[PDB]
Amino acid sequence: SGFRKMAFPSGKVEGCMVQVTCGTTTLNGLWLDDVVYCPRHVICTSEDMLNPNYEDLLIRKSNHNFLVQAGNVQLRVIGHSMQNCVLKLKVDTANPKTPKYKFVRIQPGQTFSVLACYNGSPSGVYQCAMRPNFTIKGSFLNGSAGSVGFNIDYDCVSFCYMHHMELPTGVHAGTDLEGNFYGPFVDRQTAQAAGTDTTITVNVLAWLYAAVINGDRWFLNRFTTTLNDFNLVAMKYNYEPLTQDHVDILGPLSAQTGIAVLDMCASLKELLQNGMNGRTILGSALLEDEFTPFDVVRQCKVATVQ
Amino acid sequence: SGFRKMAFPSGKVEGCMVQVTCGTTTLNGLWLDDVVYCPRHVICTSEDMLNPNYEDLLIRKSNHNFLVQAGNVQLRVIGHSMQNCVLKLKVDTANPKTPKYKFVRIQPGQTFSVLACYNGSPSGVYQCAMRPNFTIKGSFLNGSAGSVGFNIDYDCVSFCYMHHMELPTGVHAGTDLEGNFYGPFVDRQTAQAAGTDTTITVNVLAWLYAAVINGDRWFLNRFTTTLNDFNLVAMKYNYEPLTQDHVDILGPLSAQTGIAVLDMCASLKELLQNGMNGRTILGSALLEDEFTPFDVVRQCKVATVQ
Secondary structure, three states: OOOOOOEOOOHHHHOOEEEEEEOOEEEEEEEEOOEEEEEHHHHOOOHHHHOOOHHHHHHOOOHHHEEEEEOOEEEOEEEEEEEOOEEEEEEOOOOOOOOEEEEOOOOOOOEEEEEEEEOOEEEEEEEEEOOOOOOEOOOOOOOOOOOEEEEEEOOEEEEEEEEEEEEOOOEEEEEOOOOOEOOOOOOOOOOOOOOOOOEOHHHHHHHHHHHHHOOOOOOOOOOOOOHHHHHHHHHHOOEOOOOHHHHHHOHHHHHHHOOOHHHHHHHHHHHHHHOOOOOOEOOEOOOOOOOOHHHHHHHHOOOOOO | OOOOOOEOOOHHHHOOEEEEEEOOEEEEEEEEOOEEEEEHHHHOOHHHOOOOOHHHHHHOOOHHHOEEEEOOEEEOEEEEEEEOOEEEEEEOOOOOOOOEEEEOOOOOOOEEEEEEEEOOEEEEEEEEEOOOOOOEOOOOOOOOOOOEEEEEEOOEEEEEEEEEEEOOOOOEEEEOOOOOEOOOOOOOOOOOOOOOOOEOHHHHHHHHHHHHHOOOOOOOOOOOOOHHHHHHHHHHOOEOOOOHHHHHHOHHHHHHHOOOHHHHHHHHHHHHHHOOOOOOEOOEOOOOOOOOHHHHHHHHOOOOOO
């Protein structure tokens, strides 16, 4: 029993992290086979960030302008190119610790693990969710760009996020591993802002099921509702509408607890309207939305099969 | 910016995890050089756990009775001994992935990263604190015993916890890597009560500093108090006494923010006596106590030196 914010083990990703230096600018790269992937603003000085002309800046860089280090090992750059907002640096050495991997592009609501790195050195691991507004609520300082987000299944690393930038609300934006930003964000100088975020309803429901599985059930009532009725409540409180697909995905949690999904929706409606009144759920005094149904099933080993 | 529950990168520990099976009982072991460390209850079945003569039970076990698998590949046991509540199984193969390591005893209030494992396979990583009542609020199911807790300092892994058991309140107990339990617990099947837990005051202060560093300053009003007056309030709210030693270790956070420790104590006193006014701090609607001062300094790279 118990329930914690849990990341995937990070070892398979640690062996892929390198430092990339161009002049005086440094960030992290991801070394898979004989390519290092990193954010393209490594080619910018502080002066360039007034208005970076990335294509013009890159044309004056040779292979020798890129210093790539895996720990103390120097990886010689033998080619370079730009793909959307990432650079691909071809190196002379293939990474012997390259795991089985895929590059994937995820949807809002999905969670992933982040290996935060500085100067090519892994510092820590934590869990993030892709927010409905395509930001993430990470923990990133200057020098962390190029840190990646990932999930692991059957020893295959699915890389879904490369970190690029921080917005003045304290939230983070980045790309897939082909260099395409999530959301409307750009790595230019435009005075941009994130859209209004909402709460990930299906994840809150998953977390309420985790709470019941772990014995916290004071919030259960006898009532039920419908998708139509519940979604009027969701709109009022800035929650994402619940879809029937979400209801179906919650199936294994409903199956193991015996609590119908629309019954759990009626419990959530009451929590939204009246709050918790000095009580907690899984150690929290607010409704948590960064655990997916998959996250709960995996961490609590939810199964009716024996 | 940002502030997350952050674990150390787990790769160095992943390569040490193995499965130990004795009869129908399976749990995890820690493989360092030519020794596997695991909880001694692997030698027990339902038949002999109320009053297990572990010395007698171990005598009935030969080296062949211990099946050790590293990545589903068998390691041959060539010796076995018991040290307090752990077994040391000598194997004929030294682990080529053994990191630099130390076995350490942590103090109450200190944090560590847990690599949760089942059948020798790492499942996830999360952060825990050693509670004042010497339990931990983990996430552990049957088969997770032998999972370990650790911190990393300069490529040295300091192992501080090996998981053994769950108390009926849903919290967890275990040993150091010398096999001595934290707190008044035994691996015997006696009914065991944890002491009433208390809140880790110095950690709440550290987390309030983390909030300030991240821009969350609504609870600062330039008030200050004395150490004795603060400790009178702490006592009323089930908070641990704050010692001058605790004040000292908050130094780096006070240094970067310019907020004296006793000013932050006055802020915390106000939050305790009057509540959080419905507000959230760093994504929490309650006061969080599982970040140490060092955790904040590490994650936020706190320093006045440039």
